[PDB]
Enzyme design. Structure first.
Site, PDB file in Angstrom:
ATOM      1  N   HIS A  12      -2.860  55.436  49.765  1.00  0.00           N
ATOM      2  CA  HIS A  12      -4.051  55.777  50.571  1.00  0.00           C
ATOM      3  C   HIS A  12      -4.284  54.642  51.571  1.00  0.00           C
ATOM      4  O   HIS A  12      -3.537  53.623  51.593  1.00  0.00           O
ATOM      5  CB  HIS A  12      -5.282  56.148  49.679  1.00  0.00           C
ATOM      6  N   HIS A  71      -6.889  52.557  52.414  1.00  0.00           N
ATOM      7  CA  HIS A  71      -7.815  51.482  52.255  1.00  0.00           C
ATOM      8  C   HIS A  71      -7.129  50.142  52.475  1.00  0.00           C
ATOM      9  O   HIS A  71      -5.963  49.965  52.133  1.00  0.00           O
ATOM     10  CB  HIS A  71      -8.487  51.523  50.887  1.00  0.00           C
ATOM     11  N   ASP A  81      -7.197  47.353  51.027  1.00  0.00           N
ATOM     12  CA  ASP A  81      -6.626  46.737  49.802  1.00  0.00           C
ATOM     13  C   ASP A  81      -5.335  47.367  49.322  1.00  0.00           C
ATOM     14  O   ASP A  81      -4.709  46.857  48.334  1.00  0.00           O
ATOM     15  CB  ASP A  81      -7.665  46.602  48.661  1.00  0.00           C
ATOM     16  N   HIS A  82      -4.871  48.415  50.006  1.00  0.00           N
ATOM     17  CA  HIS A  82      -3.591  49.056  49.681  1.00  0.00           C
ATOM     18  C   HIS A  82      -2.583  49.011  50.828  1.00  0.00           C
ATOM     19  O   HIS A  82      -1.402  49.299  50.633  1.00  0.00           O
ATOM     20  CB  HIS A  82      -3.874  50.511  49.228  1.00  0.00           C
ATOM     21  N   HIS A 118     -10.956  60.233  45.963  1.00  0.00           N
ATOM     22  CA  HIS A 118     -11.347  58.906  46.462  1.00  0.00           C
ATOM     23  C   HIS A 118     -11.315  58.890  48.015  1.00  0.00           C
ATOM     24  O   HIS A 118     -12.253  58.436  48.675  1.00  0.00           O
ATOM     25  CB  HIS A 118     -10.340  57.901  45.834  1.00  0.00           C
ATOM     26  N   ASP A 153      -5.822  54.913  43.624  1.00  0.00           N
ATOM     27  CA  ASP A 153      -7.200  54.878  43.163  1.00  0.00           C
ATOM     28  C   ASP A 153      -7.742  56.267  42.794  1.00  0.00           C
ATOM     29  O   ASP A 153      -8.983  56.523  42.780  1.00  0.00           O
ATOM     30  CB  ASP A 153      -8.047  54.197  44.211  1.00  0.00           C
ATOM     31  N   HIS A 178      -5.760  49.389  40.437  1.00  0.00           N
ATOM     32  CA  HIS A 178      -6.595  48.240  40.041  1.00  0.00           C
ATOM     33  C   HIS A 178      -6.632  48.043  38.557  1.00  0.00           C
ATOM     34  O   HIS A 178      -6.452  49.007  37.746  1.00  0.00           O
ATOM     35  CB  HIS A 178      -8.027  48.430  40.551  1.00  0.00           C
TER      36      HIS A 178
HETATM   37 FE   LIG Z   1      -8.191  50.134  45.883  1.00  0.00          FE
HETATM   38 ZN   LIG Z   2      -9.195  52.783  47.672  1.00  0.00          ZN
END
Ligand SMILES: [Fe+3]
Ligand SMILES: [Zn+2]
Length: 254
Positions: A54, A56, A58-59, A112, A131, A169
């Protein structure tokens, strides 16, 4: 295929995928370039592919640096094509994609985000869920609906029970506290939650989980359970999607 967990940021997991016959290497969800680079220098390998579940940050935060550094190809969701940095190849639901001759089955898993995918490696009995599904929780619903999340979770749980789940995570310990607040009489959950506490006390991962475990313990997969519904005053008449949405809101505010 060897799957290497790579802790990134505070609680993210990227996964370095090592093919054994070819030395092809992929990385799933490189939050930042440095920890991936550090691991590759050790194994003494170059990166072939970057795969994102995805969009985001953080990915996807490491995508452009890794792509530039290694000449790697970024593989991501056709739904999200304009949001996946550096994307070279855009994949659709039900697409098969070959990682050095190992099949990857692409599953749209909205909830998400709208655009989230999960990556199933049947030959390795492994799914990367980003996620969408964590151990004992699901992603917060930033773009999708409870109905979409339920459907996505059910796609994942329709896979064989022995499928290992590699999620985005390390949330399992906090997740376990909320789960035990809802289903304290679930002994499989009691046992798992204790083991999780032991792992975390020695700073080890709780991932991968499995389909079997999550079916048995994850409240989001167990929303018709009488105790969970009573704990949250979810009406008997609510369907599973409505129940999930109540559980998700309760967890957010826990
Ligand atoms: Fe994440
Ligand atoms: Zn995410």
């Amino acid at each position: 295929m060897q799957i290497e967990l790579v802790p990134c940021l505070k609680d993210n997991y990227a996964y370095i995928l090592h093919d054994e016959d070819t030395g092809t290497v992929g990385v799933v969800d490189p939050s930042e370039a440095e920890p991936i680079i550090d691991s590759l220098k050790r194994s003494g390998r170059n990166l072939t592919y970057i795969l994102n579940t995805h969009h985001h940050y953080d990915h996807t935060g490491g995508n452009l640096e890794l792509k530039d550094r290694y000449g790697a190809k970024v593989i991501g969701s056709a739904m999200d094509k304009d949001r996946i940095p550096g994307i070279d190849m855009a994949l659709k639901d039900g697409d098969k994609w070959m990682f050095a001759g190992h099949e990857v089955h692409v599953m749209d898993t909205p909830g998400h985000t709208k655009g989230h995918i999960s990556l199933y490696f049947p030959g390795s009995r492994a799914i990367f869920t980003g996620d969408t599904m964590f151990s004992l929780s699901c992603g917060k619903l930033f773009e999708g609906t409870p109905k979409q999340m339920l459907a996505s979770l059910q796609k994942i749980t329709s896979l064989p029970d022995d499928t290992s789940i590699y999620c985005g995570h390390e949330y399992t310990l906090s997740n376990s506290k909320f789960a035990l607040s809802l289903e304290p009489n679930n002994e499989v959950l009691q046992s798992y939650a204790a083991h999780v506490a032991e792992l975390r006390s020695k700073k080890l991962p709780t991932i991968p989980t499995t389909v079997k475990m999550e079916k048995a313990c994850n409240p989001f997969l167990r929303s018709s359970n009488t105790d969970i519904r009573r704990a949250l005053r979810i009406p008997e008449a609510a369907d599973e999607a409505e129940a999930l949405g109540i559980i998700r809101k309760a967890k957010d505010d826990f």
